[PDB]
Write a protein that binds this DNA or RNA. Structure first.
Ligand SMILES: [Mg+2]
Ligand SMILES: [Mg+2]
Ligand SMILES: [Mg+2]
Ligand SMILES: [Mg+2]
Ligand SMILES: [Mg+2]
Ligand SMILES: [Mg+2]
Ligand SMILES: [Mg+2]
Ligand SMILES: [Mg+2]
Ligand SMILES: [Mg+2]
Ligand SMILES: [Mg+2]
Ligand SMILES: [Mg+2]
Ligand SMILES: [Mg+2]
Ligand SMILES: [Mg+2]
Ligand SMILES: [Mg+2]
Ligand SMILES: [Mg+2]
Ligand SMILES: [Mg+2]
Ligand SMILES: [Mg+2]
Ligand SMILES: [Mg+2]
Ligand SMILES: [Mg+2]
Ligand SMILES: [Mg+2]
Ligand SMILES: [Mg+2]
Ligand SMILES: [Mg+2]
Ligand SMILES: [Mg+2]
Ligand SMILES: [Mg+2]
Ligand SMILES: [Mg+2]
Ligand SMILES: [Mg+2]
Ligand SMILES: [Mg+2]
Ligand SMILES: [Mg+2]
Ligand SMILES: [Mg+2]
Ligand SMILES: [Mg+2]
Ligand SMILES: [Mg+2]
Ligand SMILES: [Mg+2]
Ligand SMILES: [Zn+2]
Lengths: 98, 129, 217, 96, 25, 87, 125, 207
RNA sequence: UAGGGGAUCGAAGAUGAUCAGAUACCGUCGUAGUCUUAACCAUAAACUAUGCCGACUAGGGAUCGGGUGGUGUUUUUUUAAUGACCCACUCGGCACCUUACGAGAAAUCAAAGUCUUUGGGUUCUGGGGGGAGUAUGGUCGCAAGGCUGAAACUUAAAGGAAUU
RNA sequence: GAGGUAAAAUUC
């Protein structure tokens, strides 16, 4: 039955907004239905920052960060450990886990 | 839009009896409700009420004593014979010893116990018990 | 023999509370079944339906027995208690007990004449447990309890001689049918009837003036 | 107003939309169109009369396993071949 | 079976049936 | 509820709520009765002379037993302009 | 590897709450005293009780033990709980004797009619 | 019916204004409480001192004229009000329940913590919500020290207080314990103040 | 259907693997199509699976659009006026959170509430599961199809919510 | 505030 409220997405009185494509399996999905992960990262790892400071010719240098916004479908966000199935009462928690 | 003012003025009263509000505020109440509220005021179901007067329709604040179970409306206004008041006072009244199915005769808006004494009939509006 | 621990239970053995209708005034809860036994020994037990309830388990199939017990004498006193247990005879022993704690008075009146000996209900009441709605309608004299034979015995043990009933929903079950009529008989006092508009000045509870014996000692 | 009209001059809508909804019963459907008269080979009757053509060995449906010893009866007033049953413990020998 | 492929089963059943009907008229 | 001669039959006239004028029935376990003392000068509460305020279980479930007690105690004469009739 | 059961912790709770005298944090005086003052059937469960009372007597002088009152915190905390500090009361104004009363609070004082010392400090938005 | 004596004294108004009892709640505000009067800016409100004192003498008037003095159980699970309810039993009978409420106490007559009181006094309706819920089954009047944002369901006459500071709760218990000792007369005089210091009813940190 | 476009993706189809078989999933290539003009068709899980109009019933925090008040803040050239923002209030929104007096078979619902203490106005649809969204007839369309729409016969269960 | 991951597996 109706286990949710909006039941698939974050559309409140629009009908149709925008289809987007997944990054893992190229699945077409609405934009508010696909979950989002702003996977911000450094351009180098934590182990490659020691050897880069010795090889740098610069006295001081600001480390760049590779920013990217990439979406997931429902089927490739559960196989990959991104989201998990929760209990019936803990579905309502919309806060990000810290 | 609005079709029955008397039906929209009793729903504010019945919701006040359930929630416990001692007063209502009804609009666009006519003088049909004025001759109707005086029926309940004579029998003691409501207290005093004050028709305020703006030029448009007026509003009424009915001070209620809390002694009212439900005052309803019968839509539309069916024609009632003298030999058919027993059908209405048995279906939608809880007991025989009380309850007032009011019905508009040519003498005015009037309960059925006075229509037996005056030997007149007419159209029905609602029921008070 | 029996040692009360409830504050109301010590006023029962001492004898300060005589009638049950004094407890019904102040909505006092009854948590021990010895309270309304020493004040009215005239109650009669009656079982209505004993059906097996089952739970699916890993190794085998676990089962229990549900007992529906309706107690109560005449003059407007009933009680409904439903208790499940692992046996049949053990379920009806504790089915009486819950029915002793669930005693509620029934207001009966007249049909259309205040002549004497009230036989029928006063107003039309309806209870709803589950899907079953039981519409109790007052009947004239000698009309009989026009109801289901499970609902009839609950009304024969109620002091009601004559009543008209209407039902709606799946009334073949007796779990929700008997509880729907049990709400309906309790709604007789919960209806504003005229000639009750006089205001009594709220008498003092028996736990206030008999608080010397109703204590820990 | 619970879907249905409640107008004081609206008895025509309440008597046509019943007739548009009486075609959902079974009893109202079999009576007007003559289903008992045209099909169901007894022509609106309770009993009839026929001639045995042959005997049957109709096996009972699952989960039971039996032979019900039926017969084939051709009617007289219609001429339709209708299967028939013998509701006793061995009156098939009593019939030919 | 699936209610869509029963629908297309009856859909190609219609085209095959009215083609035989149209060549006998 | 009486008859032709004597015989006050069908007893247990139930309690009525002092706020909403509704009948407090038997199995209404959320009902609350308030006992208020009659005090005078120099102490002397005199236990036994109560001011009984009975409230039903609907007012507490609605959440207005704090406000319904302000109306029923000021008109007796033991408050002042704390509770305003105008709102 | 090894976790004590409840019945060891039940009897050890019964010993500490009433035998805080005649027992110290040494094991050998906690072992030979349970031979008479308690009725323990076996030696193995007897040493496990005395081995756990000794573990709890070590953490009494270090800090308070929660959920266990040994008939001496019943006396030493009640004489501590009535602290009754001196005239620096933080309600009776002795330091900055005039009361810090805001603008809307000053209107509440004149509404009830009483005469009090008021120091007006305007709060910002 | 209270002629001249039971009004607000200026010797007690300095205690309420200095203990921050007149400070209200945040931007959240319950419509059911008509106690908002001259709200100070930055979102806060001002609780009426003249209305707090008068809703406090009705709370102590119900505690009086009860035959058993021990059936008035104060409930406190808040850490700021644990000390102010144990000393409420040192002066009245008034057996307290502090810390955990151990539910099944108003019902469940089998357990060893089964208390059957007559009047339950509540520090805060949010944290002591089990005491309010179980009192609706066994017919107990409930008095609570409700803040302006506290829920007001299943509670009787309440005293508008603040529960955000260290000194706002404990001085209200000092006023409730004093008025139940002026009534049931042990101190015959009301003009002279009560014997001991009001610092005894304030919670102490473990440090 | 008839022109223009035809970069990608790509129903058909050809191949490479996997597989007992693999006309598939996966890999590669590639039409029709995706784009547009001029016409047709007009069905979707066209769903909020919840007709529309009107009234009443409950608290709370946000936000969009407009407006009104500030002992307001900031931008400032000489103080301004605007704009942005804050606070308070009020309409019209998309909604949400906590609750149950109420409603429901339950999941749940400020509405599915004010409904046996069953009548505000009004339109449409449904009457056990199949056979049937099939047959025939009429009509529309270039076609695929859309709308309207049974019977014979067969079965006693199908189905919903929830618990273990 | 970032921290790994896809072979095949049909029936009673
Ligand atoms: Mg599912
Ligand atoms: Mg759509
Ligand atoms: Mg069965
Ligand atoms: Mg089993
Ligand atoms: Mg039966
Ligand atoms: Mg059909
Ligand atoms: Mg039928
Ligand atoms: Mg013939
Ligand atoms: Mg013939
Ligand atoms: Mg045949
Ligand atoms: Mg099949
Ligand atoms: Mg040809
Ligand atoms: Mg192309
Ligand atoms: Mg292919
Ligand atoms: Mg191949
Ligand atoms: Mg192929
Ligand atoms: Mg392929
Ligand atoms: Mg459609
Ligand atoms: Mg959808
Ligand atoms: Mg649809
Ligand atoms: Mg709202
Ligand atoms: Mg509700
Ligand atoms: Mg329910
Ligand atoms: Mg059918
Ligand atoms: Mg169709
Ligand atoms: Mg056709
Ligand atoms: Mg055709
Ligand atoms: Mg064409
Ligand atoms: Mg066609
Ligand atoms: Mg059929
Ligand atoms: Mg069968
Ligand atoms: Mg399951
Ligand atoms: Zn994916």
């Amino acid at each position: 039955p109706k286990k949710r409220a909006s039941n698939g997405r974050n559309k409140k009185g629009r009908g149709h907004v925008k289809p987007v494509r997944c990054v893992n399996c190229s699945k077409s999905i609405p934009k508010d239905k696909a979950i989002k992960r702003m996977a911000i990262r450094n351009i180098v790892e934590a182990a490659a920052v020691r050897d880069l400071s010795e090889a740098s010719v610069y006295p001081e240098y600001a480390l760049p960060k590779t920013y990217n916004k990439l979406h997931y479908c429902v089927s490739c966000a559960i196989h990959a450990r991104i989201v998990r199935v929760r209990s019936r009462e803990d579905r309502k928690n919309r806060a990000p886990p810290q | 839009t609005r079709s029955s003012v008397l039906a929209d003025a009793l729903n504010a009263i019945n919701n006040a009896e359930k929630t416990g509000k001692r007063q209502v505020l009804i609009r666009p109440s006519s003088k049909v409700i004025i001759k109707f509220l005086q029926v309940m005021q004579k029998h003691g179901y409501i207290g005093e009420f004050e028709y305020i007067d703006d030029h448009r329709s007026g509003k009424i604040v009915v001070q209620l004593n809390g002694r009212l179970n439900k005052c309803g409306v019968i839509s539309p206004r069916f024609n009632v014979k003298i030999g058919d008041i027993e059908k209405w006072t048995a279906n939608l009244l809880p007991a025989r010893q009380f309850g007032y199915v009011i019905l508009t005769t040519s003498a005015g808006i009037m309960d059925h116990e006075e229509a037996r004494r005056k030997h007149v009939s007419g159209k029905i509006l609602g029921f008070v018990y | 023999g029996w040692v009360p621990v409830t504050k109301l239970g010590r006023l029962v053995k001492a004898g300060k509370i005589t009638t049950i209708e004094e407890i019904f005034l102040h909505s006092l809860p009854v948590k021990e079944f010895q309270i309304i036994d020493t004040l009215l020994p005239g109650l009669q037990d009656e079982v209505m339906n004993i059906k097996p309830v089952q739970k699916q388990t890993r190794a085998g199939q676990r089962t229990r027995f549900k007992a529906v017990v309706v107690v109560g004498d005449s003059n407007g006193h009933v009680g409904l208690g439903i208790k499940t247990a692992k046996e049949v005879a053990g379920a009806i022993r504790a089915g009486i007990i819950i029915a002793k704690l669930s005693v509620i008075p029934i207001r009966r009146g007249y049909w259309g004449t205040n002549l004497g000996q009230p036989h029928s209900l006063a107003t039309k009441t309806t209870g709803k447990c589950g899907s079953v709605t039981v519409r109790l309608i007052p009947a004239p004299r000698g009309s009989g309890i026009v109801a289901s034979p499970a609902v009839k015995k609950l009304l024969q043990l109620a002091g009601v001689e004559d009543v008209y009933t209407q039902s709606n929903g799946k009334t073949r079950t007796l779990e929700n049918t008997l509880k729907a009529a049990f709400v309906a008989i309790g709604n007789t006092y919960g209806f504003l009837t005229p000639n009750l508009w006089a205001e009594q000045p709220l008498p003092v509870s028996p736990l206030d003036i008999y608080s010397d014996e109703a204590s820990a000692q | 107003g619970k879907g249905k009209p409640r107008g004081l001059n609206s008895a025509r809508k309440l008597r046509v939309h019943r007739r548009n909804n009486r075609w959902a019963e079974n009893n109202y459907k079999k009576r007007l169109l003559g289903t008992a008269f045209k099909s169901s080979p007894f022509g609106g009757s309770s009993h009839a009369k026929g001639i045995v053509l042959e005997k049957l060995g109709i096996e009972s449906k699952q989960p039971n396993s039996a032979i019900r010893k039926c017969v084939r009866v051709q009617l007289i007033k219609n001429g339709k071949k209708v299967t028939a049953f013998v509701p006793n413990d061995g009156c098939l020998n009593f019939v030919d | 079976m699936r209610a869509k492929w029963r629908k297309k089963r009856t859909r190609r059943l219609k085209r095959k049936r009215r083609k035989v009907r149209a060549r006998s008229k | 509820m009486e008859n032709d001669k004597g015989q006050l039959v069908e007893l247990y006239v139930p309690r009525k709520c002092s706020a909403t004028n509704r009948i407090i029935k038997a199995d209404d376990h959320a009902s609350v009765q308030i006992n208020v003392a009659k005090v005078d000068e120099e102490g002397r509460a005199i236990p036994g002379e109560y001011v009984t305020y009975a409230l039903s279980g609907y007012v507490r479930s609605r959440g207005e037993s704090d406000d319904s007690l302000n109306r029923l105690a000021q008109n007796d004469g033991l408050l002042k302009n704390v509770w305003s009739y105008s709102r | 590897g090894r976790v004590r059961t409840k019945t060891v912790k039940r009897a050890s709770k019964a010993l500490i709450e009433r035998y805080y005298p005649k027992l110290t944090l040494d094991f050998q005086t906690n072992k030979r005293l349970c031979d008479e003052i308690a009725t323990i059937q076996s030696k193995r469960l007897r040493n496990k009780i005395a081995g756990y009372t000794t573990h709890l007597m070590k953490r009494i002088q270090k800090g308070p033990v929660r959920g266990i009152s040994f008939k001496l915190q019943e006396e030493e905390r009640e004489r501590k709980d009535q602290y009754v500090p001196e005239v620096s009361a933080l309600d009776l104004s002795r330091s900055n004797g005039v009361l810090n009363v805001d603008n809307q609070t000053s209107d509440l004082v004149k509404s009830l009619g009483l005469k009090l010392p008021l120091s007006v400090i305007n709060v910002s938005a | 019916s209270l002629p001249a004596t039971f009004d607000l004294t200026p010797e007690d108004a300095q205690l309420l204004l200095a203990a921050n009892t007149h400070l209200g709640a945040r931007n959240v505000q319950v419509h059911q409480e008509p106690y908002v009067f001259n709200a100070r800016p930055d979102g806060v409100h001002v609780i009426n001192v003249g209305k707090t004192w008068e809703k406090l003498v009705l709370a102590a008037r119900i505690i009086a004229a009860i035959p058993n003095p021990e059936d008035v159980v104060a409930i406190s699970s808040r850490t700021f009000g644990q000390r102010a309810v144990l000393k409420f039993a040192a002066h009245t009978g008034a057996t307290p329940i502090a810390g955990r409420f151990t539910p099944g106490s108003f019902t469940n007559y089998i357990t060893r913590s089964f208390k059957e009181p007559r009047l339950v006094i509540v520090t805060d309706p949010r944290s002591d919500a089990q005491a309010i819920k179980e009192a609706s089954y066994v017919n107990i009047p409930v008095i609570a020290l409700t803040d302006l944002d506290s829920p007001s369901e299943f509670v009787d006459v309440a005293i508008p207080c603040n529960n955000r500071g260290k000194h706002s709760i404990g001085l209200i218990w000092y006023l409730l314990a004093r008025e139940v000792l002026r009534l049931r007369g042990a101190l015959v005089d009301r003009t002279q103040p009560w014997s001991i210091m009001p610092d005894l009813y304030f919670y102490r940190d473990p440090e």
